[PDB]
Amino acid sequence: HHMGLNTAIATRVNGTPPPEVPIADIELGSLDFWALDDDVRDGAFATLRREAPISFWPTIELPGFVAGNGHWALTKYDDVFYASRHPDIFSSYPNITINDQTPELAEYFGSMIVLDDPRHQRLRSIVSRAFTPKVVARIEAAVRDRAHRLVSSMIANNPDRQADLVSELAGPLPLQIICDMMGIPKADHQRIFHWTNVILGFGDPDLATDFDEFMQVSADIGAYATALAEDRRVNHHDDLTSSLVEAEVDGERLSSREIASFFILLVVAGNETTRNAITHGVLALSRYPEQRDRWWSDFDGLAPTAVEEIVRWASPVVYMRRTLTQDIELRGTKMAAGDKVSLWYCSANRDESKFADPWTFDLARNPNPHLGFGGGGAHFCLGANLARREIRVAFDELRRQMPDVVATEEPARLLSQFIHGIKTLPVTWS
């Protein structure tokens, strides 16, 4: 043989569907299933869309978490879209992952993402201006500066022209941007990143498997948030932590649990999502060179559709969970008030009922109504404009500085049923 650099990973034939998987081999409530590669996972969701578009599963038991009741899995696009856009029926309270909430977890994790309106929107409005397209556009210079420096450093730091895309670009770019928006000093950004890596890596032995470590990390980032907030209470800065401590909701300042939970939500979401879009995007360019070539020869013209196709392809957030407030029926399956419902974005984003040629990675795809940022409505990804900009700038800086950058090993995949994570991705360039 194939054209390119000698140690590049194998290419793939674009558009090839994965074989469907016998349904007896599918166990969404076992971590072992999440350790299977993406082709088996993709074929398994294909089987569910065909044979059992709504299906019930026991909740995975990770050490120290309470599985509680199982969940109804929505794997079709139209059902995920519907559930997302009916929050009075599909509530975000008490939690948006499959496990049960506890008071101990809610101290750090009881943010607006696990609330319904009106309180959810009152909290979101504290920070929403900072994430609008017009305001995010004004930090293009900061995104460029850090991406350009990171790519240059890949070259300066690696005489052998081998690097890990995750630790050297995809991780540190979004980290810098969200932490600077929050007002966190640079010296602490890597400490924040280690904390969010553990929070959203729990169950993968390379990150953490001891619940005691998970709770110490949670306590430590909560304490960090509280201390920074205290500083900003006394001396304002033009940052989001200051906005949080200065705001009032229903006539009351936020409590220290509310501040900590809001801070944690923003840095976790900012640090544990875009990096995977970027890394899966480089993996895809490596597998599908004709797509790299077409984007590189018209970068600005294709960027809007290319970024969105990277998000559809990667589906960095695998699912979100809701809880029914009333009985419903979908596709002949009667679900009860109080039951958990899981929305599988990874599956919606391959649904043949909504996408022409879903197994084709097409950077010109238009339209592209993917649910990688969710189905829309009240909780639609706050960071979506920021993420799109982070992705577009990262790829532009790769294109300009090291246009033939390519993966040289298959990814080390995060063991997670929530985050489509890549821990490392070795790359090279000429």
Ligand X SMILES: C=C1/C(=C\C=C2/CCC[C@]3(C)[C@@H]([C@H](C)CCCC(C)C)CC[C@@H]23)C[C@@H](O)C[C@@H]1O
Please report, as ranges, the residues that interact with ligand X according to CB under 6 A.
60, 62, 65, 96-99, 109, 113, 199-200, 202, 264-265, 268-269, 272-273, 317, 417-418
For residues 312 and 372, the answer to whether their CB atoms sit within 8 Å is yes
Backbone angles phi, psi at 265, to 5 degrees: -55, -45
Q: Which entry of Mg ion, ligand HEM, ligand X, none binds 428, CB below 5 to 8 A by partner kind?
A: none
Residues near Cl ion (CB under 5 A): 14, 158-160, 288, 290-291, 400
Which residue is associated with the tokens 């044979």? Answer: 51
Nearer to ligand HEM, 183 or 383 (CB): 383
Taking phi first (over 0 means left), then psi (-120 to 50 degrees means alpha), and beta for anything else, what does residue 161 get? left
Nearer to ligand X, 83 or 265 (CB): 265
Contact letters for ligand HEM, residues 230-269 (x by CB under 6 A) = -----------------------------------xx--x
For residues 198 and 207, the answer to whether their CB atoms sit within 8 Å is yes
For residues 267 and 179, the answer to whether their CB atoms sit within 8 Å is yes
Report the nearest approach of ligand HEM to the CB of residue 169 (Å). 15
Q: Going along 358-407, which residue ranges are E strands?
A: 406-407
Beta bridge partners, 44, equal none
Nearer to ligand HEM, 8 or 414 (CB): 414
Report the nearest approach of ligand HEM to the CB of residue 179 (Å). 10
Residue 270 sits in the site that holds ligand HEM (CB under 6 A): yes
Angle between helices 189-199 and 256-271 (to 10 degrees): 90
Q: Which of residues 174-193 bind Mg ion (CB under 5 A)?
A: 180
Q: Which entry of ligand X, ligand HEM, Cl ion, none binds 89, CB below 5 to 8 A by partner kind?
A: none
Q: Which of residues 360-399 bind ligand HEM (CB under 6 A)?
A: 372-375, 379-383, 386-387
Report helix, strand or coil for 56: strand
Number of residues that bind Mg ion (CB under 5 A): 1
Nearest-CB residue for Mg ion: 180
> Would you say 346 is a known binding-site residue?
no
For residues 388 and 327, the answer to whether their CB atoms sit within 8 Å is no
Report the nearest approach of ligand HEM to the CB of residue 125 (Å). 10
The closest of 270, 291, 264, 309 to 170, measured between CA atoms, is 270
Note the helical H segments in 31-129.
31-34, 38-51, 77-84, 103-109, 119-127
Q: Which of residues 279-308 bind ligand HEM (CB under 6 A)?
A: none
Nearest-CB residue for ligand X: 99
CA distance 169 to 284: 16
Cα-to-chain-centroid distance, residue 91:
20
Nearer to ligand HEM, 43 or 421 (CB): 421
Contact letters for ligand HEM, residues 144-163 (x by CB under 6 A) = --------------------
The closest of 188, 170, 106 to 316, measured between CA atoms, is 170
CA distance 385 to 108: 26
CA distance 375 to 78: 9
Taking phi first (over 0 means left), then psi (-120 to 50 degrees means alpha), and beta for anything else, what does residue 80 get? alpha
Nearer to Cl ion, 175 or 363 (CB): 363
Report the nearest approach of ligand X to the CB of residue 163 (Å). 26
Report the nearest approach of ligand HEM to the CB of residue 54 (Å). 19
Name the residues that contact Mg ion, by CB under 5 A.
Answer: 180
Annotated binding site for heme: 381
Annotated binding site: 381
